[PDB]
Amino acid sequence: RPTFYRQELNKTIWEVPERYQNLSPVGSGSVCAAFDTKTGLRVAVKKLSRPFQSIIHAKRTYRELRLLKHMKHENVIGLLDVFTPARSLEEFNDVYLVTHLMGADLNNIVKCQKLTDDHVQFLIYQILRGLKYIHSADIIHRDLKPSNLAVNEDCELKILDYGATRWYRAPEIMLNWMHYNQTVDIWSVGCIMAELLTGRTLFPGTDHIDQLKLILRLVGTPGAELLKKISSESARNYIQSLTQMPKMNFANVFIGANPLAVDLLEKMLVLDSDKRITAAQALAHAYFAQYHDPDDEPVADPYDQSFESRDLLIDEWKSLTYDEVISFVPPP
Ligand SMILES: Cn1nc(C(C)(C)C)cc1NC(=O)Nc1ccc(Cl)cc1
Numbered sequence: 001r002p003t004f005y006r007q008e009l010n011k012t013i014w015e016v017p018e019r020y021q022n023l024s025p026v027g028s029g030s031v032c033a034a035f036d037t038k039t040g041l042r043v044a045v046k047k048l049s050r051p052f053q054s055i056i057h058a059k060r061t062y063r064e065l066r067l068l069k070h071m072k073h074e075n076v077i078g079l080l081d082v083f084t085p086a087r088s089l090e091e092f093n094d095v096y097l098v099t100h101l102m103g104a105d106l107n108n109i110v111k112c113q114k115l116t117d118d119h120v121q122f123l124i125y126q127i128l129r130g131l132k133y134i135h136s137a138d139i140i141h142r143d144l145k146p147s148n149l150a151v152n153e154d155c156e157l158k159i160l161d162y163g164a165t166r167w168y169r170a171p172e173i174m175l176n177w178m179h180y181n182q183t184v185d186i187w188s189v190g191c192i193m194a195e196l197l198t199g200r201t202l203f204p205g206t207d208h209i210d211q212l213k214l215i216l217r218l219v220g221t222p223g224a225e226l227l228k229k230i231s232s233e234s235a236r237n238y239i240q241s242l243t244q245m246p247k248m249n250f251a252n253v254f255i256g257a258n259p260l261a262v263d264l265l266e267k268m269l270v271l272d273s274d275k276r277i278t279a280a281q282a283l284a285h286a287y288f289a290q291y292h293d294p295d296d297e298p299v300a301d302p303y304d305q306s307f308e309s310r311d312l313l314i315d316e317w318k319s320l321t322y323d324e325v326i327s328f329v330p331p332p
């Protein structure tokens with residue numbers, strides 16, 4: 001066990017190994033930047049907020065650790081370290097997660113820089129590349145947005161989840177469809193890409209209902225073949241109540257964009273989640289011809305998610321989380 005030192009950052013208490021120094025708050029779980037004395041690189045340390053307060057927090061904590069420990073991809077957050085100041089399972093109450101500090105997030109990059117088409121190609125390719133991997137483990141991000149994308153000075157990108165958000169969310173979520181295919185993340189990609197192309201939020205809704213109305217104005221109210229799939233009659237005529245919108249021609253919306261980008265946007269921003277391009281299909285799209293390599297777009301090892309169906313006690317979840325901390329092997 002390393003020696004742990006205590007500190008206070010925004011009234012919050014931080015006990016970390018001496019390995020990490022110059023802790024400076026970045027986010028509020030709360031996130032600090034730090035200097036890793038072992039490797040000489042800048043890291044980000046997230047302290048989990050009250051990780052075992054309820055059964056639901058506790059399962060979420062286990063979920064987070066298990067997830068991060070599995071992610072081993074260039075375009076997805078990777079775990080460098082996980083620690084607790086506790087020496088036993090009995091004292092165990094805090095969890096800290098360590099990852100490589102990429103200098104900025106995608107929102108704080110697009111806030112001034114007008115990106116070129118080549119930027120869009122490369123940034124979107126990377127998002128789709130990490131998503132191909134995430135999807136292959138049967139994981140859905142569910143909250144993809146520019147603030148959940150870390151970018152370095154080479155415009156290399158990693159997908160993570162730091163934990164309006166609605167601006168990038170699939171319409172079938174905001175209407176609790178329940179199901180969700182993995183192309184909910186593809187909808188979010190379309191929203192991001194559109195914004196990288198125009199420099200403007202695509203659907204900047206003021207609230208939940210404005211969000212949906214802005215969406216329908218672009219993509220149109222549901223076609224016959226979509227309505228054909230709606231099990232619930234309540235839902236079916238709630239939809240058939242809303243103003244009947246024609247689908248917009250995207251070429252007439254993204255006026256000066258690369259016609260291949262417009263074509264890809266059309267395949268991503270389809271209302272019917274069954275008709276949406278997948279991550280793997282999108283990688284093979286001609287828009288990314290300069291970046292696509294079918295032998296360097298890897299998929300994930302099998303990910304055992306059976307815990308998700310389990311209903312356990314706080315101490316059980318807590319205990320399983322502790323085992324995962326102890327058994328952690330850092331990357332090379
Ligand atoms: C919950 N979750 N889901 C994912 C995906 C889906 C991208 C693999 C990633 C994560 N979790 C995180 O990305 N967590 C995290 C940990 C430390 C820092 Cl400094 C920032 C973020």
Ligand SMILES: CCCCCCCCO[C@@H]1O[C@H](CO)[C@@H](O)[C@H](O)[C@H]1O
Nearest residue numbers: 171172179180181229271272273274
């Ligand atoms: C305004 C109404 C637009 C929302 C239409 C939802 C289109 C998605 O379509 C549905 O999505 C589910 C996602 O889990 C799939 O599992 C269903 O089988 C599919 O039919």
